[PDB]
Amino acid sequence: AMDLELSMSETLTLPVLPLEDGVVLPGMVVPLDLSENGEVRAAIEAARAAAQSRGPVSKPRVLLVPRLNGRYADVGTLGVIEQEGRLPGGEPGAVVRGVSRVRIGTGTTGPGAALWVEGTVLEAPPASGRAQELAKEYKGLVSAILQKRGAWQVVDVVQQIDDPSTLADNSGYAPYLTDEQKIEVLETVDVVERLELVIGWTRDHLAE
Amino acid sequence: AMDLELSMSETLTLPVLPLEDGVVLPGMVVPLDLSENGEVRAAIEAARAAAQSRGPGIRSVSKPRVLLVPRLNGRYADVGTLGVIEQEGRLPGGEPGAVVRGVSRVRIGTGTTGPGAALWVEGTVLEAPPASGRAQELAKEYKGLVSAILQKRGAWQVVDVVQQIDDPSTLADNSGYAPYLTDEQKIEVLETVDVVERLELVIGWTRDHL
Numbered sequence: 001a002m003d004l005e006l007s008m009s010e011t012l013t014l015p016v017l018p019l020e021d022g023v024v025l026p027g028m029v030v031p032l033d034l035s036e037n038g039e040v041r042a043a044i045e046a047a048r049a050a051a052q053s054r055g056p057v058s059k060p061r062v063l064l065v066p067r068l069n070g071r072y073a074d075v076g077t078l079g080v081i082e083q084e085g086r087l088p089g090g091e092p093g094a095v096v097r098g099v100s101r102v103r104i105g106t107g108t109t110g111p112g113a114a115l116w117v118e119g120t121v122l123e124a125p126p127a128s129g130r131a132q133e134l135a136k137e138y139k140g141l142v143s144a145i146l147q148k149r150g151a152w153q154v155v156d157v158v159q160q161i162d163d164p165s166t167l168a169d170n171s172g173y174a175p176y177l178t179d180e181q182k183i184e185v186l187e188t189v190d191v192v193e194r195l196e197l198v199i200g201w202t203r204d205h206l207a208e
Numbered sequence: 209a210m211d212l213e214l215s216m217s218e219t220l221t222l223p224v225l226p227l228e229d230g231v232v233l234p235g236m237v238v239p240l241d242l243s244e245n246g247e248v249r250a251a252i253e254a255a256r257a258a259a260q261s262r263g264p265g266i267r268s269v270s271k272p273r274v275l276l277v278p279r280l281n282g283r284y285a286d287v288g289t290l291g292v293i294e295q296e297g298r299l300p301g302g303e304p305g306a307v308v309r310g311v312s313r314v315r316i317g318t319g320t321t322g323p324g325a326a327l328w329v330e331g332t333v334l335e336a337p338p339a340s341g342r343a344q345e346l347a348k349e350y351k352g353l354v355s356a357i358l359q360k361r362g363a364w365q366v367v368d369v370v371q372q373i374d375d376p377s378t379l380a381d382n383s384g385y386a387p388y389l390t391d392e393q394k395i396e397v398l399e400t401v402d403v404v405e406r407l408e409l410v411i412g413w414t415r416d417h418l
Contacts, residue, residue: 019210021210022209023210033211033214085332086217086219087215087217088215090315092317093214179209
């Protein structure tokens, strides 16, 4: 038997992948153009280098932090570099999948040229009763918007998102929500008030 | 305002099989002399290992996949040809040989790692978009040019099929068999993905040789 105490702690040290004008929320799968900003590929390389200093399957994991006009948010998104590819102009590209919220903590040092920060992962709690109820309403509101656009496959797949937190964070795909609105969705930890937040904006966009 | 509708192509990882002389274009099938050639045989063995079957009893061995890249005194081309090792055995001359079929164009990108002693690079399969209407007219004009050369050469079995090739991309890439074209021209054929450009390239080179 081994003791092992105060381990598996919730505070991680992750490289910051800055999103200059974009927000990636947990559950989202988005492409990343690595041609435009140097700090982006440096964060992926720093994440991969730290995995190679731990010695020998880990797809590299970064901390997706939106940076609106030179200022980082208080919450980041733990993201997995699922795959690297090429964009139509031959740009180096990467597929990233958001996993969970990470409350941004104090800065730290690490390998590579990326900024390393410490942070505590905010494990999503089990869904409450109002969250399930709010998820049903948000599905209907989002479906109505997609129906006017004729995006019926999108209607079909959105209706299959049964986790209320994942459904609320699916608002990151909405083109009618501003970058700053999606930052507030990221920083709103509680799912119920996060759903009520995106439900109001979605209800506002329908009324236009 | 991140772009959430970006088209993302898949990135392949293949062992580099260097070709000192000659360019293998998509649609071609050629032999490979493995005699006293460590680089070529290492690429095939690295491809075989990377193709090792992945199940306890249901595992099926796939054909090895290599990247046939046009290299003269270094300076590997920016585009290689995805090659499928169709057969392995001995060539008629007695040499240890392999038969490779060119499949598609691959844009050579970042280097990487892999099994075996071969050099591994990352690459992207380049689209073969449907032939334009103008591309159809380039193919009809190009068939008349290559037919005159083949009929002058007496290659009647070849000219029979060449003028039946419906796809303009396959028709243009068949110029890799032509002795009257140089490898620097062939590498440029391997270089231009657009079928309209290639036909418009090879039509000019064919006329200036006729």
